[PDB]
Amino acid sequence: MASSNLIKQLQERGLVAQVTDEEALAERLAQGPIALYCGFDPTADSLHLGHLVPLLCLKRFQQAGHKPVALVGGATGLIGDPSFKAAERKLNTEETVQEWVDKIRKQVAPFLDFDCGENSAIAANNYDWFGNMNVLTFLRDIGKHFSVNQMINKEAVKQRLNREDQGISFTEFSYNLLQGYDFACLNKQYGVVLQIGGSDQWGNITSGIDLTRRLHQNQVFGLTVPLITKADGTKFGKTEGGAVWLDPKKTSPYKFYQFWINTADADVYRFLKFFTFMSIEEINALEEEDKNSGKAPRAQYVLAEQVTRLVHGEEGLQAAKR
Amino acid sequence: MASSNLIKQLQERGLVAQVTDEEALAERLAQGPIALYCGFDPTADSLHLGHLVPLLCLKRFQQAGHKPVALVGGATGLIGDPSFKAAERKLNTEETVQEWVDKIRKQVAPFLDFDCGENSAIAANNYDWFGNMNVLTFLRDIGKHFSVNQMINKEAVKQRLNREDQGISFTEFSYNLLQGYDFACLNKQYGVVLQIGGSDQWGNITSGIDLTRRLHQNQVFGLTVPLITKADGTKFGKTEGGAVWLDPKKTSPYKFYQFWINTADADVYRFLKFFTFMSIEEINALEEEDKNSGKAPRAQYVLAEQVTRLVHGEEGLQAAKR
Numbered sequence A, B: 001m002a003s004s005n006l007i008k009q010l011q012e013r014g015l016v017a018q019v020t021d022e023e024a025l026a027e028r029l030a031q032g033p034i035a036l037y038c039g040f041d042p043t044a045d046s047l048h049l050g051h052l053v054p055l056l057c058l059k060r061f062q063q064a065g066h067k068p069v070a071l072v073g074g075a076t077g078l079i080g081d082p083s084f085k086a087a088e089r090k091l092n093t094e095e096t097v098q099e100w101v102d103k104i105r106k107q108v109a110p111f112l113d114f115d116c117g118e119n120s121a122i123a124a125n126n127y128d129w130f131g132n133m134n135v136l137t138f139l140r141d142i143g144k145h146f147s148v149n150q151m152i153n154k155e156a157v158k159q160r161l162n163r164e165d166q167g168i169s170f171t172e173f174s175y176n177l178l179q180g181y182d183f184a185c186l187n188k189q190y191g192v193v194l195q196i197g198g199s200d201q202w203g204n205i206t207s208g209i210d211l212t213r214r215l216h217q218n219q220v221f222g223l224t225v226p227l228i229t230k231a232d233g234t235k236f237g238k239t240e241g242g243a244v245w246l247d248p249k250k251t252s253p254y255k256f257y258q259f260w261i262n263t264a265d266a267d268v269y270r271f272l273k274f275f276t277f278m279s280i281e282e283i284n285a286l287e288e289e290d291k292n293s294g295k296a297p298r299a300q301y302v303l304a305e306q307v308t309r310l311v312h313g314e315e316g317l318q319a320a321k322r
C-alpha cells in the first residue's frame, strides 16, 4: 500500500496539530481522491480570520486532487459549540441564522473550485437533516451511542464542568452529538472519510469517527490544524475594533491588507506558511533574504499581497492601494 | 391561610417519603381543589404492584376533592427512566410502545372516577407534545434551562456516573428533561400544581418544579411515596415467576389474591395502610385484635379482599374463591 506525502507536506508548513492513525490516513490518501469536509457555524453573518486556516486547508486538499465539502452549520449554529469556551454562546433566532447561513455559504464558495471535474467542491448544511428531525428519534437513534461518562471527560468541556466559576447547559452539552452525526451523514451520502478542523475541534471530530463506525461500520479519519498564535502571546485575528472579517463590507480589503502589513517579524514567516500557497522553498528563501538584505523585510508585503488576493481577489488587492 | 390535613393524614399511613414546602402545599390544598398528576411509563403492556401505591394515592387525593391526572408515558417510554437503575433500560419500538400505552391507559381508568363533576380525572400522554417536537426546539427551548453540572449531581443517576462498573447513555441522561417538561406542560394546560410519584422520582419531580418556575413563573409542588419494603429485606412485588401484574390476563385475580394472603405478619398492617382505604383507626384495631385473639390473624384475609376488589372488582374477588 502506497503512502501519500500530503500529511507530511502539511506538517512542513506547521499545519498539523493532531491526526488520527496518520499511517493509515496517508495510505488511504494514496489510494485515490477522497471526499473530506470541514464545518463552519453561522455565529455571525460572516466568517473571520479564525476560520481562514481550515478553509484554506480544504483548498490545499483539493489542490492535491481531493474533493472538499464545505458544511455551514444551519442547525449547529442554533445550538452553539462550547469547545474550549468559557461561557455559553448567545442563542440566535432561527430566522436570523437562516439568513447568516446563506451569506456564509456564498462567502465560502469563491475559496473553492466547484467546477473542476469529479473533485469539484460541494456545499452542505446540517439543517437538512436536523431541521426536521424529531427529538425522540435523535435521543434514541443517535443518543444511544453516546456515553455521558465519556462526554464529561472530553477536554473541550472539562473546564466548564470542573471550574466552579462556570457551567454548561444541556443545549451546548448536546452539540458534540450533532457534529458527530454530521460526519456519519456526510460519510453515508458523499463518501466523506476525513474531517479537518481547528485545534479546538478534536473531540467533536473523534466523536464523529466513533459514531460513523457505530452506525455505518466505516473507518473515517480526522485532522486538526494548530491554534494560530502570535509570538507576543496575544490572540490572533483580534484587534481593538473586533475581529477581522472576510466580508469586504465588514472589513474593507484596504483594512484587511493593512492588518497583514502589521504582522510582526516573529510571526510573518510562519504566517506565510499558514495563509499562502507559496512553496516552503520560496518562503525559506524569503526569510533568508530578509535576514541578510539590510532592508525592510519584504515578507509582510508579500504576505499581505498573497492573502488579500486569496480573500478579496485581484479587485480587493487593487482596492488596498487606493 | 388555612392548612389542609391531607398531607398529615397520608403521613399517618406512612405514605409520605419527601415533600416540597410542606407548609405551603398544605395551605394551597386548603384553598380549594387542585389538579395533580402522576405519570406511568409503558415499560410493558401492563402496570404491576410497583405502580399501585402511587396510583391509589391519586385516588386518595381525589377522595379529598382534588382532581387527578393520570399520565401514560407515550414518549418517555421510548427513552427510559434511569433513576436508581443499575443498567440501561431496553429500547422498545414506537409501534409496540404505542399499543402498550393504549392498554395501560385502559387499565388505569377503572382506578379513578372520570364522572364525578369538576374533580373528574383526566388521562394524558406526553407523546402529544414530544411525538412531533423537533430536536433543535427541544435542545434550545427546554435544554437551555438545564445545567449539566446539576444533572450529574442528581442522586438518581450518581451511581451510573460514579461506579466504574456501569455508565449511562445520552438517551437516558435526557429523560429528566422530558419528565421535567411534562410537569410544566400539565401546569400550563390543566393548572396542575402538584406531582406525586414513587420514591425514586424525587429528582425528576423537582426538575419539573424548577422548569415550571423558569418557563411559566408558577410555584408547583412535589411529593413522593416511600419505597415499599418487606421486613425480610427482599423486593416487594417480586416473586419467582416475575412481577405481579394488574392485568388479569397476566396475573389472574385468584393468583393476585393468593399473593396478598401470603403477606408476612410483619408487613401486613403496614400494607393495609399502603394499599387500602380502611381508616387508620380500623387498621390499628385490627392489629390489636390479631394480637390478642389467639387465632390466625385476619389481617392477611382482609388485605387480600380489599386490594383484590380495588384491582379486579367484585368479579375478581369472586374469581379468587373458584
Ligand SMILES: N[C@@H](Cc1ccc(O)cc1)C(=O)O
Pocket (backbone or CB within 6 Å): A038, A039, A040, A041, A071, A073, A076, A081, A126, A178, A179, A180, A182, A183, A197, A201, A204
Ligand atoms: N464546530 C465547528 C463547526 C462545525 C459544525 C458542524 C460540523 O459538522 C463540523 C464543524 C466550529 O465551532 O467551528
Ligand SMILES: N[C@@H](Cc1ccc(O)cc1)C(=O)O
Pocket (backbone or CB within 6 Å): B038, B039, B040, B041, B071, B073, B076, B081, B126, B178, B179, B180, B182, B183, B197, B201, B204
Ligand atoms: N418516570 C416515572 C414515570 C413518569 C413519566 C412521565 C412523567 O411526567 C412522570 C412520571 C416512572 O419511571 O415511573
